[PDB]
Amino acid sequence: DLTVKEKEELIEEWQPEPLVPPVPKDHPALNYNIVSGPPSHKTVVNGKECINFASFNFLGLLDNPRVKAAALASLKKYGVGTCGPRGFYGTFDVHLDLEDRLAKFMKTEEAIIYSYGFATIASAIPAYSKRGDIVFVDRAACFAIQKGLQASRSDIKLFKHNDMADLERLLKEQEIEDQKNPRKARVTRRFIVVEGLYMNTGTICPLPELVKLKYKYKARIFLEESLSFGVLGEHGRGVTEHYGINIDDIDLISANMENALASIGGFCCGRSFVIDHQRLSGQGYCFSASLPPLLAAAAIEALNIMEENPGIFAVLKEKCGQIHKALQGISGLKVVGESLSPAFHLQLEESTGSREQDVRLLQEIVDQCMNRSIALTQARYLEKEEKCLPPPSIRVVVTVEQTEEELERAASTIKEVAQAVLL
Amino acid sequence: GLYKRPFNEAFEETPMLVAVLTYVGYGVLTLFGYLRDFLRYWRIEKCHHATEREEQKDFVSLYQDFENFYTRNLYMRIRDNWNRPICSVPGARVDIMERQSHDYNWSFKYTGNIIKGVINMGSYNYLGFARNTGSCQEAAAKVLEEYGAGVCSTRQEIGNLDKHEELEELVARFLGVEAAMAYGMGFATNSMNIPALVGKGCLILSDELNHASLVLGARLSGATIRIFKHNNMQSLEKLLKDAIVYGQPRTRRPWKKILILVEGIYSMEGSIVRLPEVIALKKKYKAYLYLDEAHSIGALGPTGRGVVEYFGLDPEDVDVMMGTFTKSFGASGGYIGGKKELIDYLRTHSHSAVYATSLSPPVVEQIITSMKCIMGQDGTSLGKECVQQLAENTRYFRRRLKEMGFIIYGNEDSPVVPLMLYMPAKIGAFGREMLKRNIGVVVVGFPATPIIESRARFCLSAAHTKEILDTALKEIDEVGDLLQLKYSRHRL
Amino acid sequence: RAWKQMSWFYYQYLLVTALYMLEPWERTVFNSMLVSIVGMALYTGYVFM
Numbered sequence: 001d002l003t004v005k006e007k008e009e010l011i012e013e014w015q016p017e018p019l020v021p022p023v024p025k026d027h028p029a030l031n032y033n034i035v036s037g038p039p040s041h042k043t044v045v046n047g048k049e050c051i052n053f054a055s056f057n058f059l060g061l062l063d064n065p066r067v068k069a070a071a072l073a074s075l076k077k078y079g080v081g082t083c084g085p086r087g088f089y090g091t092f093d094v095h096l097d098l099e100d101r102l103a104k105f106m107k108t109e110e111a112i113i114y115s116y117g118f119a120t121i122a123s124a125i126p127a128y129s130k131r132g133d134i135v136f137v138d139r140a141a142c143f144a145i146q147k148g149l150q151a152s153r154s155d156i157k158l159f160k161h162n163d164m165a166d167l168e169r170l171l172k173e174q175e176i177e178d179q180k181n182p183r184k185a186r187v188t189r190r191f192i193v194v195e196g197l198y199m200n201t202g203t204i205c206p207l208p209e210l211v212k213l214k215y216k217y218k219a220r221i222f223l224e225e226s227l228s229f230g231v232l233g234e235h236g237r238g239v240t241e242h243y244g245i246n247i248d249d250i251d252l253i254s255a256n257m258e259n260a261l262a263s264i265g266g267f268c269c270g271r272s273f274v275i276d277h278q279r280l281s282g283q284g285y286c287f288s289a290s291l292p293p294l295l296a297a298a299a300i301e302a303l304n305i306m307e308e309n310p311g312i313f314a315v316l317k318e319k320c321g322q323i324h325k326a327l328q329g330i331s332g333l334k335v336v337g338e339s340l341s342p343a344f345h346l347q348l349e350e351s352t353g354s355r356e357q358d359v360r361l362l363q364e365i366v367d368q369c370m371n372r373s374i375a376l377t378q379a380r381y382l383e384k385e386e387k388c389l390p391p392p393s394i395r396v397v398v399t400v401e402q403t404e405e406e407l408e409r410a411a412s413t414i415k416e417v418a419q420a421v422l423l
Numbered sequence: 424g425l426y427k428r429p430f431n432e433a434f435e436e437t438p439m440l441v442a443v444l445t446y447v448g449y450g451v452l453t454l455f456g457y458l459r460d461f462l463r464y465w466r467i468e469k470c471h472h473a474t475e476r477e478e479q480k481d482f483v484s485l486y487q488d489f490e491n492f493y494t495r496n497l498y499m500r501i502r503d504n505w506n507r508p509i510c511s512v513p514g515a516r517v518d519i520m521e522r523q524s525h526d527y528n529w530s531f532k533y534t535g536n537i538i539k540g541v542i543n544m545g546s547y548n549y550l551g552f553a554r555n556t557g558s559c560q561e562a563a564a565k566v567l568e569e570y571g572a573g574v575c576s577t578r579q580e581i582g583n584l585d586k587h588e589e590l591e592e593l594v595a596r597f598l599g600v601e602a603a604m605a606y607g608m609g610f611a612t613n614s615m616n617i618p619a620l621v622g623k624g625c626l627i628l629s630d631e632l633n634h635a636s637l638v639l640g641a642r643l644s645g646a647t648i649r650i651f652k653h654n655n656m657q658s659l660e661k662l663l664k665d666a667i668v669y670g671q672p673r674t675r676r677p678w679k680k681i682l683i684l685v686e687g688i689y690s691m692e693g694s695i696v697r698l699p700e701v702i703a704l705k706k707k708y709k710a711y712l713y714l715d716e717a718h719s720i721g722a723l724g725p726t727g728r729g730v731v732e733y734f735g736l737d738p739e740d741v742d743v744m745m746g747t748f749t750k751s752f753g754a755s756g757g758y759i760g761g762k763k764e765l766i767d768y769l770r771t772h773s774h775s776a777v778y779a780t781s782l783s784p785p786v787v788e789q790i791i792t793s794m795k796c797i798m799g800q801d802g803t804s805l806g807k808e809c810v811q812q813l814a815e816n817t818r819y820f821r822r823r824l825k826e827m828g829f830i831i832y833g834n835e836d837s838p839v840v841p842l843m844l845y846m847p848a849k850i851g852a853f854g855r856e857m858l859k860r861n862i863g864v865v866v867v868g869f870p871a872t873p874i875i876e877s878r879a880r881f882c883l884s885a886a887h888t889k890e891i892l893d894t895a896l897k898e899i900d901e902v903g904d905l906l907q908l909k910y911s912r913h914r915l
Numbered sequence: 916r917a918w919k920q921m922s923w924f925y926y927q928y929l930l931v932t933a934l935y936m937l938e939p940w941e942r943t944v945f946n947s948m949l950v951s952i953v954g955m956a957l958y959t960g961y962v963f964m
C-alpha cells in the first residue's frame with residue numbers, strides 16, 4: 001500500500017539501538033580476580049597469598065601427584081586435542097573406559113559423557129521432554145536446569161523450596177485436570193526435576209517423599225547432583241546412597257566432573273533404555289567435539305583414588321560439621337545451609353533496601369578478609385535472567401586439605417571482620 | 424560487492440532418475456520398518472531394544488514409537504559406520520579398534536585385532552597441529568605439571584587465571600580486533616552468548632544452513648527469527664527491506680536491533696559465504712553482523728587469519744567474530760572478538776562467565792603455542808609452509824575428483840570436500856568399502872542433511888603428503904566404479 | 916567371467932533397491948512378492964494376446 005518514496009524515507013529515517021548498552025554502573029563483576037599460579041590450598045590472589053576457601057575442590061584431587069602423572073601419560077600417548085565429534089572418529093578408548101568406570105562406580109547400567117559441565121544438564125532435559133508435557137521443578141534450581149527447561153517447550157510449574165505439601169497440591173490439581181481431558185491426558189508426560197544438594201541454598205532434598213509421590217502420581221524423577229555426587233554417603237555414591245534409596249527408583253542422574261573430580265566435563269547415568277536416547281537427541285553430545293583424552297584419564301585416576309580411600313568422605317563430613325558449628329554466633333550475619341553441606345552461604349541478617357549497598361558491604365567484608373590472608377568469594381548471579389533471584393551471599397567452601405587450625409582461624413577472622421563492618 | 428579475485432562455486436543439480444530411486448529405496452525401507460514394528464508388537468520376535476521396568480509400565484510411555492522409528496529401523500541397520508573407536512593420535516594415519524556384531528548392529532563386541540595405519544579423512548587437523556611430539560606438547564606438559572589439569576571455579580569467582588588473560592590478549596592481537604574473550608566450548612559460546620546480545624523485540628536473520636548451536640542460541644533468546652535462502656543475497660535484501668519497513672508483527676513498532684548470523688565455511692555444504700555483499704547490505708541497512716569462523720579460522724587466508732583476510736576486507740567491519748580452536752589449533756575451546764565495549768559487556772553479562780567453569784590450563788597453553796607458531800613469533804618457518812601445503816592439497820584433491828566425474832559441492836578453495844551419494848544403502852556401502860581398502864571416511868545422512876542429499880565428507884590437512892592423496896584417490900576411483908557413483912555429466 | 920558379471924548385476928540390484936541393508940529373510944520375502952507380481956502381470960498380459 002505504501003508508495004515507494006515513503007518506503008525509502010522510512011528505511012533511511014530508521015536508526016537501530018547500539019549492539020551493547022553502555023554500562024555506567026561500575027560493576028564489581030567487571031573487576032575480576034587475578035589468580036597467580038594454580039588455584040589450590042595456599043594460593044596467591046591479587047598478589048596476596050591466601051588460603052583457598054572459595055574454590056570448589058572438595059576432595060583435594062586437583063594437585064594429587066598421581067592424577068598429574070596419569071594425565072601426563074595420556075598426553076604423551078594421544079595429544080592435547082581430539083579433533084572431532086563423538087560420531088566421527090572422535091571416540092577414543094579412554095572415553096569408553098571412563099564411561100565403564102562411571103557405570104560401575106554408580107552401580108548403574110549405562111553412563112554418558114558430555115565435554116562441558118553446563119551442557120550435560122542443559123541438554124539432558126530437552127531430549128526427553130517435548131512440547132505439551134508438564135514439568136515440576138524446584139524453585140531454587142540452578143541456572144543450568146532453568147536453561148534446560150527453557151530450551152524445551154514443555155510447560156513449567158515451580159513448587160516451593162523443600163515443601164512436599166506444595167508438590168502434592170500441584171499434583172492433585174494436575175490429576176483433576178487429567179480427569180477433565182483424558183485424550184490429552186494419555187499423551188502428556190509428568191517430570192519432577194530436583195537437585196541433589198542445592199548450590200543456591202545449600203540444603204538437601206527429601207528423597208523418600210519424592211519417591212512416594214512419584215509412585216503415587218506417576219511422574220518421572222530427574223535428579224541433578226553437581227555437589228552431592230562426591231561428598232555425601234559412606235562411599236560417596238551420592239544422595240541416593242546417603243538416604244538409602246534404591247538407585248533403580250531414580251530415572252536419570254546428572255552430574256558434572258569439575259567440582260569433585262577436578263576435571264572438565266559432566267556425565268549422566270541411568271538405565272540403557274533412557275540413556276541410549278541421549279546419544280542421538282543430545283545437542284551438546286552430537287554437535288560438539290569430544291572431551292580431550294588428558295581430562296578423561298585424569299578423571300579415571302581420580303575415580304581410582306576415590307574407590308581406594310573411602311575415609312576422605314568421613315573427614316570431609318567432620319570438617320563441614322566443625323566449621324558450620326563454629327560459624328554459628330556471628331552478630332551481623334546468618335548461616336544458610338546444613339551441617340553435611342560442604343559449600344554453604346553467609347547472608348546478611350537484616351538487609352538494607354538497596355541490593356547494591358548489600359553487595360558493597362559483602363565485598364568490603366571479602367576484601368578485608370583477603371587482607372587478613374583468608375580468600376573468600378561472593379555468589380554471582382544474573383539479576384535479570386534468574387527466574388528466582390537469591391539474596392546476596394558470601395560462599396564458604398570446606399575442603400579435606402584445610403586443617404583444623406586453619407578452620408578455627410578463618411572462623412575467628414570472619415567473626416572479627418563482620419563485627420567490625422556490620423556495626 | 425567488490426571481489427579482488429574470482430569467486431567460483433558449483434552445486435550440480437540432482438539427476439531425476441537418481442531422485443526417483445532414492446524415494447523408492449526410502450519407501451521400501453519405511454515399509455519394512457513398519458513390518459518389523461508390527462512383528463515386534465505381537466512378540467513373535469524378542470525386542471532387543473530395552474523396555475522400561477515392570478513397575479513403570481503403568482506410566483505414560485516415555486518414547487513415542489514413531490518418533491524413534493528412524494532410529495529403530497533405519498539408523499540401527501548401518502550403525503557400524505559411525506562411532507568408530509580409535510586408539511592413536513588422529514594424524515594422517517590413525518589406528519581403529521576393530522569391532523563386529525552378531526545381532527545386526529544391536530550390540531557391538533570388540534575383537535582383539537586393531538587396524539593399523541588407516542588413512543584418516545574424518546578428523547579436521549587442517550594445519551596438522553595434532554601431534555604427540557613437538558614444542559606444543561612439551562609446553563603443555565610443563566603447564567600441566569605446574570598448574571594441574573582442570574580448574575574448579577567460574578571466571579567471575581576465584582576461577583579466573585592469568586593464563587586466560589594471556590590467551591585473551593594473544594587472540595586479540597592475532598585476529599586484529601581490539602579485544603576478545605575465551606570460552607570452554609564453541610557450542611557453549613553460541614548457546615550462551617546469542618541470548619546476551621539480543622532480547623525480545625529484536626530480529627535475527629539466520630541462514631538456512633546454520634549450525635545447530637546458532638539456532639539453539641537464537642531460540643533461547645526471545646528475538647524473532649526469520650530464515651533467508653542459503654547464500655542468496657536477493658533474499659537477504661528482500662528480508663531486510665520488509666523487516667525495516669513493516670516492523671514488528673503484532674504491533675507495527677520499529678525493530679530495536681537487526682542481527683544477521685552467518686558462518687565462514689559451512690561444514691556440510693562446503694560453500695564460503697559471500698562476505699563483501701553481506702557487508703555492503705549491512706552498511707546500507709544499518710544491521711549488525713555475527714560471523715562464525717569455526718571452520719575457516721586457520722584454513723583460509725594467505726597467512727591463515729581467516730575468511731576476512733581471504734576476501735581482503737577490514738576486520739573492524741564485522742561486529743562479532745566468533746571462532747573455535749578445535750578445528751585447526753588442535754585444542755577444545757571457543758572465542759569471541761570485537762570492540763572493547765562488546766567484550767566488557769560480555770565479561771559482565773555472559774552465561775558462561777558466571778555459571779560455567781573456566782578453560783583448562785594445558786589446553787590454553789597448547790593454543791598459545793599453536794598461535795605463536797602460526798604468527799611467526801616462534802622463529803620457525805613452519806607457519807607459512809603449513810598454509811601453502813594445505814592450499815596445494817585442497818586444489819589438487821578437488822581437481823582430481825572433478826576429473827573423475829563425481830558430483831562435488833562448494834567453492835573450489837574450500838578444504839572440506841563433500842562427495843554426493845544420493846541413496847540410502849550406498850551410505851553404508853561406501854563407508855564399509857572404503858574402510859575395507861584402508862581409508863577412513865565420514866558419511867552423513869538425514870539427521871544432518873536433507874533426505875535426498877546424502878554425502879561423504881573429506882577434510883583435507885597439511886599433514887597429508889602427496890603419496891597419501893594418490894593412494895586415496897586411486898581407491899576412491901575404484902570404489903566409485905564399483906558402486907557407480909559418477910553422476911556428473913559435464914566432465915567424466 | 917560371466918559369473919562375476921551376473922554377480923555384479925545382482926549387487927547393483929541390491930544397492931539400488933536398498934535390499935543391502937535388509938536381513939536375508941526380508942530379502943527373500945521381497946523377492947518372492949516381486950516375482951509373484953511379475954508372473955501375475957505376465958499371465959494377465961497373455962490374456963490380452
Ligand SMILES: CCCCCCC(=O)CCCCCC/C=C/C[C@@H](O)[C@H](O)[C@](CO)(NCc1c(COP(=O)(O)O)cnc(C)c1O)C(=O)O
Nearest residue numbers: 085087287288289608609610634690717749847867868869
Ligand atoms: C539412511 C540411514 C542414514 C543414517 C545416518 C545417520 C547420521 O548421519 C547420524 C550422524 C552421527 C553424528 C552426527 C555429527 C554431526 C556433526 C555436524 C558438524 O557440523 C559439527 O557440528 C561440527 C563438529 O562438532 N561443528 C563444530 C562447530 C561448532 C562447535 O565446535 P566445538 O565447540 O569445538 O565442538 C560450532 N559451530 C560450527 C559452525 C562448527 O562447525 C563440524 O563442523 O564438524
